[PDB]
Amino acid sequence: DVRPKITLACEVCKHRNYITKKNRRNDPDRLEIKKFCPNCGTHQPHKES
Amino acid sequence: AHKPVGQNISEVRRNARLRRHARLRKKVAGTAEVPRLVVNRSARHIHVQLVNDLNGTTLAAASSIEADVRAIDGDKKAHSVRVGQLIAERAKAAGVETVVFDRGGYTYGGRIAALADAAREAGLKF
Amino acid sequence: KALPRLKQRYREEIREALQQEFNYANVMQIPGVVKVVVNMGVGDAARDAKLINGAINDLALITGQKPEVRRARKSIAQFKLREGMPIGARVTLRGDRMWEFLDRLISIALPRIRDFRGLSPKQFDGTGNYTFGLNEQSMFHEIDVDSIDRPRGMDITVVTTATNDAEGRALLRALGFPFKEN
Amino acid sequence: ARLVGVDLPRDKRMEIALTYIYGIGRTRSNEILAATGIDKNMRTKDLTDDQVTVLRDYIEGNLKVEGDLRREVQADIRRKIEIGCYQGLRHRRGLPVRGQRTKTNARTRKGPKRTI
Amino acid sequence: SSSRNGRDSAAQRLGVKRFGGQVVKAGEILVRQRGTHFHPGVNVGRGGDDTLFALAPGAVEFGAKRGRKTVNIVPVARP
RNA sequence: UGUAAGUGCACAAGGGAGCUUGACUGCGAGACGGACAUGUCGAGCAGGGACGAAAGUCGGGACUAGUGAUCCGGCACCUCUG
Numbered sequence: 001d002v003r004p005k006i007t008l009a010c011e012v013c014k015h016r017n018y019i020t021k022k023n024r025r026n027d028p029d030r031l032e033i034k035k036f037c038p039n040c041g042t043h044q045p046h047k048e049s
Numbered sequence: 050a051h052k053p054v055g056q057n058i059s060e061v062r063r064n065a066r067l068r069r070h071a072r073l074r075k076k077v078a079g080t081a082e083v084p085r086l087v088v089n090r091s092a093r094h095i096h097v098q099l100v101n102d103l104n105g106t107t108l109a110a111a112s113s114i115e116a117d118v119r120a121i122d123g124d125k126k127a128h129s130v131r132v133g134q135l136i137a138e139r140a141k142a143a144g145v146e147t148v149v150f151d152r153g154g155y156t157y158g159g160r161i162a163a164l165a166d167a168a169r170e171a172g173l174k175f
Numbered sequence: 176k177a178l179p180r181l182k183q184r185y186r187e188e189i190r191e192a193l194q195q196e197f198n199y200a201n202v203m204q205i206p207g208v209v210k211v212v213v214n215m216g217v218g219d220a221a222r223d224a225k226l227i228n229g230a231i232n233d234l235a236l237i238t239g240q241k242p243e244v245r246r247a248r249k250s251i252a253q254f255k256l257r258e259g260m261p262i263g264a265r266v267t268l269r270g271d272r273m274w275e276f277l278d279r280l281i282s283i284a285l286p287r288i289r290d291f292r293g294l295s296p297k298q299f300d301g302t303g304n305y306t307f308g309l310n311e312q313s314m315f316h317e318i319d320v321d322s323i324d325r326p327r328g329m330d331i332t333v334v335t336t337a338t339n340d341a342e343g344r345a346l347l348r349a350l351g352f353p354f355k356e357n
Numbered sequence: 358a359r360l361v362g363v364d365l366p367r368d369k370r371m372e373i374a375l376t377y378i379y380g381i382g383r384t385r386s387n388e389i390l391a392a393t394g395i396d397k398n399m400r401t402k403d404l405t406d407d408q409v410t411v412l413r414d415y416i417e418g419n420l421k422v423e424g425d426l427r428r429e430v431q432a433d434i435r436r437k438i439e440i441g442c443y444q445g446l447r448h449r450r451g452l453p454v455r456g457q458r459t460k461t462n463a464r465t466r467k468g469p470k471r472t473i
Numbered sequence: 474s475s476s477r478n479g480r481d482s483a484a485q486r487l488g489v490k491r492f493g494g495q496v497v498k499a500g501e502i503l504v505r506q507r508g509t510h511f512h513p514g515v516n517v518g519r520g521g522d523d524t525l526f527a528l529a530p531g532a533v534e535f536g537a538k539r540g541r542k543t544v545n546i547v548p549v550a551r552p
Numbered sequence: 553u554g555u556a557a558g559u560g561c562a563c564a565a566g567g568g569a570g571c572u573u574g575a576c577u578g579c580g581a582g583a584c585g586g587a588c589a590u591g592u593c594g595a596g597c598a599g600g601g602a603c604g605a606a607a608g609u610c611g612g613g614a615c616u617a618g619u620g621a622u623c624c625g626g627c628a629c630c631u632c633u634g
């Protein structure tokens with residue numbers, strides 16, 4: 001498939017909100033980006049599941 | 050009967066300065082209620098002017114060439130600070146508060162930095 | 176509280192020698208050295224990139240300033256070269272480093288080359304600049320003969336303010352480059 | 358030990374340790390050890406730095422080894438191949454120059470065997 | 474024998490949309506052009522899709538500036 | 553100037569370098585053409601951010617193709633019901 005669909009989840013509240021695509025071949029390791037979580041109210045690290 | 054062969058450092062410098070000044074001007078503008086502060090830097094002095102782009106006329110200006118500034122014993126950085134507070138006072142007398150900077154292409158630092166801090170201290174909002 | 180001897184020579188005797196010999200208009204039409212460039216063309220980077228490190232080390236030892244690597248702007252198939260690879264290193268100095276390097280060269284390197292017959296005066300380009308190449312690098316004392324793995328040549332270029340060939344030739348000949356006689 | 362960029366054997370007699378240098382051989386090693394006065398049966402564990410330094414100085418003063426020898430041999434090769442000499446032509450063709458029985462011998466020079 | 478041609482796309486209805494002397498209401502679209510066939514002037518912004526529009530009410534007034542085809546909006550006086 | 557053409561870009565949208573994920577959330581005054589629903593842009597407000605001293609820019613990619621209604625069902629959460 002080359003481009004699977006992945007979902008990003010918050011670390012404290014555990015809600016899956018954002019979804020994006022990536023290259024598993026290019027980046028075998030997992031992603032870690034900072035987005036905005038609505039209930040938490042502040043930027044928090046996000047780790048894909 | 051001597052013909053120079055290569056372009057001169059003076060013109061490399063002048064052309065680069067003009068090009069980068071135009072680069073910044075592409076985004077930086079001015080208006081009547083917010084006159085633009087321009088600075089022209091030299092190896093021996095410093096110049097500052099206030100210009101309204103709508104009419105192409107200046108409101109006030111000052112430079113270190115003046116005798117009172119020249120009389121200061123301190124460094125030419127101190128001269129820059131002196132002219133900075135002088136232009137701050139002149140602009141306040143004119144009746145303008147909000148202004149923007151036209152660095153003129155010269156990289157920020159040193160004299161420009163000191164002038165900016167002196168202005169900010171004098172009580173101009175920007 | 177120091178000054179290179181070559182710089183001394185130049186500013187004391189060479190300047191007025193050339194001035195009186197060529198009858199210049201003012202005291203600053205006399206040409207002066209500008210810069211000097213050192214580089215090599217290997218072409219074996221495509222097959223192995225280890226020798227590049229060795230070249231960098233030799234340049235660092237001989238000059239004392241870490242060189243810079245250069246990439247290729249044109250990918251070519253029949254030479255099996257593509258964009259992005261480094262092939263050679265370039266070094267340029269200024270000022271007292273030129274003075275010291277030229278002193279060391281003129282005083283040590285030139286007399287030491289096996290079968291040294293001089294330098295061809297017709298190596299100029301017509302604008303008053305000099306550049307020539309070497310086939311070996313072990314002549315220099317700073318490099319120990321035991322630690323070299325392969326023989327590597329080099330190319331040397333010097334650029335001055337001479338308007339044309341004549342002024343630069345006179346200046347450098349007064350400096351004392353061992354040319355031929357033709 | 359080490360000498361002139363050559364790693365001497367971990368455990369071997371000096372008469373062979375010096376032999377392993379390109380410019381020194383069996384009888385040459387015998388001659389240098391006789392001149393220096395160092396006995397020839399000792400192993401590589403009994404050497405001293407000062408003896409190595411003096412030996413290096415003597416050999417570099419009275420002989421050329423390794424890189425110098427290789428480059429001068431190659432200089433001879435290129436000059437003989439350029440002058441158009443018979444030895445130059447033999448080098449071009451890849452054969453011993455003395456004119457041995459190349460009909461059957463010279464296999465060592467010509468290298469492996471290829472069948473037509 | 475046959476032909477491999479005969480296919481075509483649709484049309485995007487591109488082109489100028491408002492002319493000079495027009496009373497333009499705030500936020501109106503002025504020109505829909507593909508490239509940068511025109512450059513923004515005073516009180517004129519350019520969108521993501523190379524679209525030129527107006528920011529304040531006024532009258533359309535074209536012009537040129539140093540070898541450019543420019544778009545300008547004049548603030549007609551309030552009656 | 554990733555991917556065809558055109559329109560453009562020598563002031564850069566070409567290349568090089570430092571930092572960082574706005575490829576956000578809640579909104580939208582008005583227009584674009586369309587028989588129908590699909591399609592396009594947008595100033596400006598609030599929260600909390602990024603870059604930059606400041607002025608200031610950021611709701612993915614110089615622009616126009618990389619896609620698919622209805623019904624049924626799965627998964628996480630919810631101050632709905634029962």
Ligand SMILES: [Mg+2]
Nearest residue numbers: 025026027028
């Ligand atoms: Mg990567």
Ligand SMILES: [Mg+2]
Nearest residue numbers: 302303304335
């Ligand atoms: Mg020249």
Ligand SMILES: [Mg+2]
Nearest residue numbers: 477478479480
């Ligand atoms: Mg087809």
Ligand SMILES: [Mg+2]
Nearest residue numbers: 482483484485
């Ligand atoms: Mg069409």
Ligand SMILES: [Mg+2]
Nearest residue numbers: 521522612613
């Ligand atoms: Mg876009």
Ligand SMILES: [Mg+2]
Nearest residue numbers: 564566567568
């Ligand atoms: Mg760029």
Ligand SMILES: [Mg+2]
Nearest residue numbers: 019020021575
């Ligand atoms: Mg997306």
Ligand SMILES: [Mg+2]
Nearest residue numbers: 580581582583
């Ligand atoms: Mg509407």
Ligand SMILES: [Mg+2]
Nearest residue numbers: 598599600601
């Ligand atoms: Mg905000």
Ligand SMILES: [Mg+2]
Nearest residue numbers: 594595596611
């Ligand atoms: Mg916006």
Ligand SMILES: [Mg+2]
Nearest residue numbers: 521522612613
């Ligand atoms: Mg974009």
Ligand SMILES: [Mg+2]
Nearest residue numbers: 565612613614
């Ligand atoms: Mg881009």
Ligand SMILES: [Mg+2]
Nearest residue numbers: 621622623624
């Ligand atoms: Mg159905």
Ligand SMILES: [Zn+2]
Nearest residue numbers: 010013037040
């Ligand atoms: Zn959360």
